[PDB]
Design a binder for this molecule. Structure first.
Ligand SMILES: *[C@@H]1O[C@H](CO[C@H]2O[C@@H](C)[C@@H](O)[C@@H](O)[C@@H]2O)[C@@H](O[C@@H]2O[C@H](CO)[C@@H](O[C@@H]3O[C@H](CO[C@H]4O[C@H](CO)[C@@H](O)[C@H](O)[C@@H]4O[C@@H]4O[C@H](CO)[C@@H](O[C@@H]5O[C@H](CO)[C@H](O)[C@H](O)[C@H]5O)[C@H](O)[C@H]4NC(C)=O)[C@@H](O)[C@H](O[C@H]4O[C@H](CO)[C@@H](O)[C@H](O)[C@@H]4O[C@@H]4O[C@H](CO)[C@@H](O)[C@H](O)[C@H]4NC(C)=O)[C@@H]3O)[C@H](O)[C@H]2NC(C)=O)[C@H](O)[C@H]1NC(C)=O
Ligand SMILES: *[C@@H]1O[C@H](CO[C@H]2O[C@@H](C)[C@@H](O)[C@@H](O)[C@@H]2O)[C@@H](O[C@@H]2O[C@H](CO)[C@@H](O[C@@H]3O[C@H](CO[C@H]4O[C@H](CO)[C@@H](O)[C@H](O)[C@@H]4O[C@@H]4O[C@H](CO)[C@@H](O[C@@H]5O[C@H](CO)[C@H](O)[C@H](O)[C@H]5O)[C@H](O)[C@H]4NC(C)=O)[C@@H](O)[C@H](O[C@H]4O[C@H](CO)[C@@H](O)[C@H](O)[C@@H]4O[C@@H]4O[C@H](CO)[C@@H](O)[C@H](O)[C@H]4NC(C)=O)[C@@H]3O)[C@H](O)[C@H]2NC(C)=O)[C@H](O)[C@H]1NC(C)=O
Ligand SMILES: *[C@@H]1O[C@H](CO)[C@@H](O[C@@H]2O[C@H](CO)[C@@H](O[C@@H]3O[C@H](CO[C@H]4O[C@H](CO)[C@@H](O)[C@H](O)[C@@H]4O)[C@@H](O)[C@H](O[C@H]4O[C@H](CO)[C@@H](O)[C@H](O)[C@@H]4O)[C@@H]3O)[C@H](O)[C@H]2NC(C)=O)[C@H](O)[C@H]1NC(C)=O
Ligand SMILES: *[C@@H]1O[C@H](CO)[C@@H](O[C@@H]2O[C@H](CO)[C@@H](O)[C@H](O)[C@H]2NC(C)=O)[C@H](O)[C@H]1NC(C)=O
Lengths: 212, 169, 210
């Protein structure tokens, strides 16, 4: 009983994929509620209203609510997504009165450069056996951002990054918390916080931190 | 000398959705007649009094005229075949003050529609749990403006194109 | 299928924790038609019915729907002891009355650690300075964080939502923006936290230029 017919959801690429030129940023078009009686689904893709033909269609997957799910994926050009190109997914099915269209674009508004600060462990952890290192990233727009930790070249495993939070000026801020053993901190070990954003020079910045 | 033939629509709606049925009737003389139908000013081989359209396609749009043996050629009648989920239909779109305004929110293929809202100039006027006709008993000047209806077809949120309703003094 | 939907909301963490405050459980009935009759409410605290709920009349919305809101006052310790709260929505032409139920999140309660962080030297040379508060190792996520200067409420702060940590506990960050001059004066800023696993449900942590 799928009265409305199939519905369409269009997802943006992962922040990191659009920023590193070696990555492959993909736009994902998910179609749900496809009926067993009418399962054939056709995809049309448009970049700024111009049809492209390099999209890959994944095969239909049965769902436990006895409905089909079809996903189409289009790899976008890095520059094109960043410059604010509109990507349109047009979906056809016989359970519909007309093809359904969806549109995504990088969030409108002027990009703002993030500011990156490191923060040594608080006085609270002087007795504790492990310490928290903080990486405050603030003043960025849009929220599309990625944060990683590394020490001596090797990526650090024990960290969590808070989601972007809207600040009072319209820009976003977040904090990434790395947890390391106190002893590693006692030693003059240098930990680094790498931040990736579109408004940064070469889409990359790095701030280091140590017991100096 | 001879009566001017008249094309009536059944149902009365000159705007329809694809797959709806429309019967076009020809009133020439009142006594039941060799009938002649026209579409986009060219004859259709149908000689019956009624011209039935089982499922409307976009090609069914255009002007329609009829002529019986005992009548003169009729004035044209427009037909608009739309594509979409919802169409806001009415008998007329021009209302005199204190006249009834009666609207329907018609769905494609007559698909069950629930949580129906009728909106005037962006604001909702009336909400129903199930699809129901919108009705104003006494028209006022404040009832004038832009109208559309929306609702859920299953879980999908769908809406009709806006139609303009004017109220004359 | 009836039409109107029902949603049941928990009380605000501060209200459940501060004894002077009034914690409320709210039952909201949305998409009420004009053709719907009078909506009736029945509240149950662990099966047991209560009759102290002040129910507001039907209120007209901008999309021509109606909204009926019923607010129940709850006892502080009743909520903390994990008691089930039922909202029974009944109507004259309703086959089966709608029942919704919410309660305090289950699990091992963990006390939060309050950690003040002085502003970065690499920011100290700017118009306004930001002070930081790392609140971590708490469960459940239900929390309230506030700032004050010399014991009096500070407004200009933003807090991250609780984030799930590797050990299953939650952590967050609060940022307070202050004038550098106020920091230079040696004013005592403090980060105050309210959580169920704290003694007196309240703790505080000092921060000043030493
Ligand atoms: C039958 O079952 C179907 C699915 O299977 C289910 O079966 C069971 C087991 C059950 O238990 C389910 O758990 C299971 O899923 C079911 O289909 C579902 O339909 C829902 C609607 O009815 C859909 O809900 C939508 O969800 C959107 C977000 O979806 C993401 O997040 C959820 C978890 O929260 C996740 O489950 C989804 O998979 C999806 O995850 C994302 O997936 C993408 C692409 O796969 C990932 O992209 C990555 O991209 C990179 C590229 O670098 C790389 O390639 C990666 O490989 C690739 O994965 C994302 O990373 C991933 N994200 C996350 C966080 O995981 C919502 O956005 C959407 O909201 C919109 O619509 C709402 C109304 O429906 C509305 O309230 C809301 O406001 C919003 O409206 C939109 O607003 C926009 C502006 O902001 C407008 O522009 C839009 O026009 C507007 N749209 C509309 C319609 O108004 C919505 O809630 C659900 O996604 C879908 N599930 C799946 C798995 O497809 C079906 O409904 C069932 N049928 C019945 C009858 O029950
Ligand atoms: C017509 O328009 C209606 C409103 O439009 C406007 O009307 C104007 C006149 C004006 O009123 C405007 O404000 C208004 O916008 C519209 O009604 C809306 O319907 C929606 C559903 O269709 C409702 O969505 C739900 O929202 C829930 C959360 O809502 C909060 O946040 C929204 C903003 O995002 C806000 O609008 C709501 O009011 C609500 O805010 C909270 O309100 C409570 C109670 O008042 C407050 O708490 C109290 O505070 C007081 C102090 O004031 C006191 O301290 C008390 O102690 C305290 O309790 C809060 O302060 C306040 N919080 C915030 C943050 O603002 C969602 O939870 C809910 O999600 C669930 O359901 C979805 C499916 O429907 C699903 O997608 C989702 O996953 C989730 O799923 C499940 O839900 C089940 C129940 O159905 C549960 O059993 C499961 O647990 C759950 N599962 C999971 C996995 O999560 C949902 O999205 C919306 O609330 C409602 N808006 C209003 C204002 O009523 C109406 O639909 C329109 N009609 C038509 C026909 O178009
Ligand atoms: C089908 O799909 C449509 C979406 O297209 C849904 O309709 C939308 O419904 C949502 C509510 O869920 C609407 O959002 C609300 O819009 C209100 C519009 O107010 C108008 O009028 C005032 C003047 O009094 C103007 O200021 C304003 O610009 C508007 O013109 C707002 O009042 C609401 O604001 C509330 O929430 C915000 C949170 O950010 C608060 O700041 C406010 O205090 C307030 O509480 C809200 O934004 C939305 O506008 C609707 N869109 C349309 C196009 O109609 C349908 O509901 C959906 N489903 C069904 C079944 O039809
Ligand atoms: C009769 O004329 C109408 C024009 O009034 C034709 O309808 C058009 O059809 C095309 C596609 O074939 C659409 O792109 C247009 O939108 C339609 N016009 C309108 C106003 O809706 C119709 O096809 C003609 N039919 C015949 C049988 O000749």
């Amino acid at each position: 009983e799928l009265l409305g017919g199939p519905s369409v959801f269009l997802f943006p690429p992962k922040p990191k994929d659009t920023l590193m030129i070696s990555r492959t940023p993909e736009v994902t078009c998910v179609v749900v509620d496809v009926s067993h009686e009418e399962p054939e689904v056709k995809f049309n893709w448009y970049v700024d209203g111009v049809e492209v033909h390099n999209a890959k269609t994944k095969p239909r997957e049965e769902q436990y609510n006895s409905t089909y799910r079809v996903v189409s994926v289009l790899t976008v050009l890095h520059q094109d997504w960043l410059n604010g190109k509109e990507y349109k997914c047009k979906v056809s099915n016989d359970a519909l009165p007309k093809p359904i269209e969806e549109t995504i674009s990088k969030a409108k508004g002027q990009p703002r450069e993030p500011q990156v600060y490191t923060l040594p462990p608080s006085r609270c952890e002087l007795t504790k056996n492990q310490v928290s290192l903080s990486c405050a990233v603030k003043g960025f727009y849009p929220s599309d951002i990625a944060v990683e930790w590394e020490s001596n070249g090797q990526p650090e495993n024990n960290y969590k990054t808070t989601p972007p939070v809207l600040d009072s000026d319209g820009s976003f801020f977040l904090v990434s918390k790395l947890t390391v053993d106190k002893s590693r901190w006692q030693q003059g070990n240098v930990f680094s916080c790498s931040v990736m954003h579109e408004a940064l020079h070469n889409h990359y910045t790095q701030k280091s931190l140590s017991l100096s | 000398d001879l009566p001017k033939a008249v094309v009536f629509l059944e149902p009365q709606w000159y705007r329809v959705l694809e797959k709806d049925s429309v019967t076009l009737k020809c009133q020439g003389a009142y006594s039941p007649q060799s009938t002649q139908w026209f579409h986009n000013e060219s004859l259709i081989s149908s000689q019956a009094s009624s011209y039935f359209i089982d499922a409307a396609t976009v090609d069914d749009s255009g002007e329609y005229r009829c002529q019986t043996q005992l009548s003169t050629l009729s004035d044209p009648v427009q037909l608009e075949v739309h594509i979409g989920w919802l169409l806001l239909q009415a008998p007329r779109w021009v209302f005199k003050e204190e006249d009834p305004i009666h609207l329907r929110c018609h769905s494609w293929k007559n698909t069950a529609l629930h949580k129906v809202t009728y909106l005037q100039n962006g604001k909702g006027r009336k909400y129903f749990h199930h699809n129901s006709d919108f009705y104003i008993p006494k028209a006022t000047l404040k009832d004038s403006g832009s109208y559309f209806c929306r609702g859920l077809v299953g879980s999908k949120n769908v809406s009709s194109e806006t139609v303009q309703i004017t109220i004359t003094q």
